[PDB]
RNA sequence: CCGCGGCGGUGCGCCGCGACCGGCUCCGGGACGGCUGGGAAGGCCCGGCGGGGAAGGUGGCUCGGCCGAGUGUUACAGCCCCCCCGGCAGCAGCACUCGCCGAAUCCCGGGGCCGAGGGAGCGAGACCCGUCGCCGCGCUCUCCCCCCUCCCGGCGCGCCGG
RNA sequence: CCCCGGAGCCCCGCGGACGCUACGCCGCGACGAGUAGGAGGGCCGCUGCGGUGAGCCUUGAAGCCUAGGGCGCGGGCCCGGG
RNA sequence: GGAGCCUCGGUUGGCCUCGGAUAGCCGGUCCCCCGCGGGGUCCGGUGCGGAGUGCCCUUCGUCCUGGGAAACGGGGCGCGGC
């Protein structure tokens, strides 16, 4: 199961050729000179008197609807989200600083930790400083400030992934009708694993941030546009 | 003259016009030259069997 | 704790002299006056934000009297840093010469 | 949130043009010292031009007909009114933002007031060209209150000269203060000139 | 059939004219080759300036 | 009933993302051709040959402290310029953007916008589905080796064995 | 080198739509100003007749009115309430 | 101090010389004149204006404790007089 014997030159253009590839792959020397009725297909079981019984796995249906929709047309190149390729603004590098633009943690400043599987950012404005925990964000609702901490050698937990940072509650039936059922439940509880994860990560960062003078105080502060200062003019 | 602009096209011009806006007349139906099977079917009796031949 | 949106005035609709094409707002973004200063603002979310008699809902909030019409700055309109917008509904005309908020948050920065 | 523009040294229509668009974009504007607005073209030229405008009246009942305002403030208002769609609701709303004054009265006599340099005489005219003060013009066409407006402005300039002297006095002490303190603001003052002020 | 524009859509170009592949394989390589050779001139000019 | 397993149509209401294609409008990079086989330029300097403005000059006068500044004349070169012979690699339509025309002599990457509009499965003991053309490749049914090393296994973070 | 009452199917000539009111259904192109005027189609509309709806109707017909719900490009139409 | 219809716009402030433009701004006067200032001369600084609206002022998380530099500043819609 060898890798790709020609590399990529451009998306869709291999470096080599047809002819170089014939020689590389060596098509010379790799020449392959090669010149129901009664028996039931897929049923079968056991059983007592009379003899054995022939069942039928996947038995034809007990209701047809009166009309139903008729197929589609194959359509070529339409991958599900999981199989997508993930981008990242070059500005956003690990241990950089963001300004989170949208949520409740709005205008708050933050440190960027990693791009998760999803394509979301993982983020921490060390809970301690900012009041921003280990948290997902989107590239698109974040301003990649030109300010970096050196975060190279911090072992972020392998177990913290997209799958963990994912909302949890609510199933279907229960009592339902009346003045009850899951309008209560009430609170997302923080849990202890979550608190342990934070504790571990922050300690590795937290010394690193402090080394930079005033940086903690910067990371405490909140961003906002005052008079006379225009996004397009200033830099971050 | 005062109804047209005209002159001597480049090589690139003949390509860009043919590839981007090359439409056959095929049973009097303007049809886009999506494959050479179209060009050939019509012009193949002249030795013209592909977009490239057409351009030449 | 402060303002996370750049100010802009609703100039009026994209229009010829004598045919206004109501489906496209024009937006005089504050502090920008060159078809040059305005590549920042292309494709940013923007809100006509206004309040009305009856109460409404509110995302992550209790029922309010404020309402908004969301839109998007599409392209730069003529030399002096006006900008075209397009809104999920057309803007009211009541709106002329009033604030609309151009956000930061489809950022490419 | 409000423009105050010292109409002195500006050009009548040139300023009015710029004011109109500000006013149409919801900007509340105030235009002050309107008698000081000055109009290109030699004096006599413009007097006749006004006197013509006076002649325009509704023959059968002048009481209806085009009301020729004398005061420089109202004149300037008239010319700004000529660049808005003032028959519309939005046009009428626009003018309601604009606020014009002969001389400079009490809210704005202690406000810093801007200057539109694109309407300014020193820039927009050749120096050998002639022009008219809209005051003189207003005076001769019947404006009653030139002298009053002059006598009130001499007070204001005297009142202001005092303020400036005290302002200067603070500035001077502040220049002294920094020098008194410049070893215990030294590693602040250094950082405010790495990122490029104080130079 | 939808007309995919050959000049943007590589594989449509190839469908209509397969010799494109080679023509474009050349003129990536060719341009890289020459770009390298420009850096090499520039390095020799800097070395000549240092000498 | 729990499986939200497999397929099919759906979303109560308001939202957002993602990647793919179409049509646009921009941005940034690079690589080439042709010319008066570009014109000017730069850099190194050497040997000559004249002509001009006008000079470290001189001179009348003036203005300042022999020196500096301002006019005026004959004009060599000790400020330059110009022509003519003869010769060097650094040029290159040159980021020292001084003046073009282009691209089988042309490619790469990026951003904003609008749009998705169609539906080659209605079998009774064996798919509720692929896919046509094109790209190549990639792989394998051929052996080799090298490297890195993710999982796992072993040995001392280092080394050895998908 | 064998038979589809079974090759398992991208093509199948052994039998054939979910589709086929053949005045139906489906696909590709192109095009679309209009007086006078002409022609076509109107499951547009009015009143009466032969047929036909085992139609509807005092458990409420026709008409009338309706800031009720919809359909149709439109002529118009259908439902809710009074 | 409490509720409760309605109408909306807003989403840091700027508390000021006069003016000139083939000129201005600031200092300081050793010296002189006028009513701490005003006017003068002289000198010293700036002048594509940094005593700059290309500007200035203001900060934008809350608290805890326990050091340093800075330190008598702030408040009680604190209270009376000029
Ligand atoms: Mg017609
Ligand atoms: Mg007719
Ligand atoms: Mg509000």
List keywords for this structure.
part of a larger assembly, 5 chains, B: 56 residues, 3 helices, 43% helix, D: 3-stranded parallel sheet, 8 helices, 5 strands, binds magnesium ion, Large ribosomal subunit protein uL4 (chain E), ubl conjugation (chain A), phosphoprotein (chain A)
Task: Give a written overview of the molecule.
It is classed as protein transport. Keywords: Protein translocon of the endoplasmic reticulum, protein transport. Cryo-EM Structure of the Mammalian Oligosaccharyltransferase Bound to Sec61 and the Non-programmed 80S Ribosome. Chain A is 60S ribosomal protein L6. This is part of a larger assembly, with chains A (236 residues), B (56 residues), C (109 residues), D (199 residues) and E (51 residues). Chain B is of the alpha+beta class. Chain B has helices at 11-21, 36-43, 51-55; strands at residues 23-26, 29-32. Chain C has 109 residues and is mainly β. Chain C has no helices and six strands. A six-stranded antiparallel β-barrel of chain C has the order 1-2-5-4-3-6. By secondary structure, chain D is mainly alpha-helical. Classes of the chains: A alpha+beta (236), B alpha+beta (56), C mainly beta (109), D mainly alpha (199), E mainly alpha (51). Chains in contact: A-C, A-E, B-E, C-D. The A-C interface holds A 89, 91, 101-102, 104, 106-107, 140-144, 222-226, 228, 230-233, 236 and C 1-6, 30-32, 37-38, 40-41, 60, 103-109.
Largest interface: A-C, 23 and 21 residues
Backbone structural class of chain B: alpha+beta
H/E topology pattern of chain D: EHEEHHHEHEHHH
- Proportion in helices of chain B: 40-55%
User: In what order do the strands lie side by side in the largest sheet of chain D?
Assistant: 1-2-4
Distance between the termini of chain B: 28 Å
By DSSP (H or I, 4+ residues per run), the number of helices of chain B equals 3
* Cα separation of the termini of chain D: 31 Å
Helical proportion of chain D? 40-55%
- Arrangement of strands in the largest sheet of chain B: 1-2
Q: What's the order of the H and E elements of chain B?
A: HEEHH
| CA-based gyration radius of chain D | 22 Å
Instruction: Specify the number of helices of chain D.
Output: 8
How would a crystallographer describe the biggest sheet of chain D? 3 strands, parallel
Quaternary structure annotation:
part of a larger assembly
Shape of chain D: elongated
| Radius of gyration of chain B, taken over Cα atoms and rounded to an integer in Å | 13 Å
**Which strand-content bin applies to the residues of chain D?**
5-15%
Shape of chain B: globular
Subunit structure (chain A): Component of the large ribosomal subunit. May bind IPO9 with low affinity.
GO cellular component, one term (chain A): rough endoplasmic reticulum
Keywords (chain A): Cytoplasm, Endoplasmic reticulum, Isopeptide bond, Phosphoprotein, Ribonucleoprotein, Ribosomal protein, Ubl conjugation
Subcellular location (chain A): Cytoplasm, Cytosol; Rough endoplasmic reticulum
């Amino acid at each position: 199961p060898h890798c790709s014997r020609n590399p990529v030159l451009v998306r869709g253009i291999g470096r080599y050729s047809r002819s170089a590839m014939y020689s590389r792959k060596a098509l010379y020397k790799r020449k392959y000179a090669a010149p129901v009725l009664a028996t039931v297909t897929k049923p079968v079981g056991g059983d007592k008197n009379g003899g054995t019984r022939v069942v039928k796995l996947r038995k034809m249906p007990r209701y047809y609807p009166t009309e139903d929709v008729p197929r589609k047309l194959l359509s070529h190149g339409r991958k599900p989200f999981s199989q997508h390729v993930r981008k990242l603004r070059a500005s956003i590098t690990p241990g950089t600083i963001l300004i989170i633009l949208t949520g409740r943690h709005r205008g708050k400043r933050v440190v960027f930790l990693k791009q998760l599987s999803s394509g979301l950012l993982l983020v921490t404005g060390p809970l301690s400083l900012n009041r921003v925990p280990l948290r997902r964000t989107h590239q698109k609702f974040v301003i990649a400030t030109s300010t970096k901490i050196d975060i190279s050698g911090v072992k972020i937990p392998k177990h913290l992934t997209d799958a963990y940072f994912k909302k949890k509650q609510l199933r279907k039936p229960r009592h339902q009708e009346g003045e009850i059922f899951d309008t209560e439940k009430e609170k997302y509880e923080i849990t202890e694993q979550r608190k342990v994860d934070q504790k571990a990560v922050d300690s590795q960062i937290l010394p690193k941030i402090k080394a930079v003078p005033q940086l903690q105080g910067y990371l405490r502060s909140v961003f906002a546009l005052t008079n006379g200062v225009y996004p397009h003019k200033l830099v971050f | 003259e005062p109804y047209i602009a005209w002159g001597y096209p480049n090589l690139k011009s003949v390509n860009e016009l043919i590839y981007k806006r090359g439409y056959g007349k095929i049973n009097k139906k303007r049809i886009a030259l999506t494959d050479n099977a179209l060009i050939a079917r019509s012009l193949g009796k002249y030795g013209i069997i592909c977009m490239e031949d057409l351009i030449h | 704790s402060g303002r996370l949106w750049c100010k802009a005035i609703f100039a009026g609709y994209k229009r010829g002299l004598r045919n206004q094409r109501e489906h496209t707002a024009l937006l005089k973004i504050e502090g920008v006056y060159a078809r040059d200063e305005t590549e920042f603002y292309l494709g940013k979310r923007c809100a006509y934000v206004y309040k009305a008699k009856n109460n409404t809902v509110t995302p992550g909030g209790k029922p309010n009297k404020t309402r908004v019409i969301w839109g998007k700055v599409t392209r730069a309109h003529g030399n002096s840093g006006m900008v075209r917008a397009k809104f999920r509904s057309n803007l009211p005309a009541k709106a002329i010469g009033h604030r609309i908020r151009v956000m930061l948050y489809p950022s490419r920065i | 949130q409000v423009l105050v523009l010292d109409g002195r040294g500006h050009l009548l229509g040139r300023l009015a043009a710029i004011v109109a668009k500000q006013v149409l974009l919801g900007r509340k504007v105030v235009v002050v010292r309107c008698e000081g607005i000055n109009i290109s073209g030699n004096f006599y030229r413009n007097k006749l031009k006004y006197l013509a405008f006076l002649r325009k009246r509704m023959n059968t009942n002048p009481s209806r007909g085009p009301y020729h305002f004398r005061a420089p403030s109202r004149i300037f208002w008239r010319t700004v009114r000529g660049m808005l769609p003032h028959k519309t609701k939005r046009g009428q709303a626009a003018l309601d933002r604009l606020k014009v004054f002969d001389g400079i009265p009490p809210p704005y006599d202690k406000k810093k007031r801007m200057v539109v340099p694109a309407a300014l005489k020193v820039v927009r005219l050749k120096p050998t060209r002639k022009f008219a003060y809209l005051g003189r013009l207003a005076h001769e066409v019947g404006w009653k209150y030139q002298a009053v407006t002059a006598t009130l402005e001499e007070k204001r300039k005297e009142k202001a000269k005092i303020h400036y002297r005290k302002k200067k006095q603070l500035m001077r002490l502040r220049k002294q203060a920094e020098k008194n303190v410049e070893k215990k603001i030294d590693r602040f003052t250094e950082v405010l000139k790495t990122h490029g002020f104080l130079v | 059939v939808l007309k995919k524009n050959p000049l943007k859509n590589l594989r449509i170009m190839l469908k209509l004219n397969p010799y494109a592949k080679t023509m474009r394989r050349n003129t990536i390589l060719r341009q890289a080759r020459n770009h390298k050779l420009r850096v090499e001139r520039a390095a020799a000019a800097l070395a000549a300036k240092k000498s």
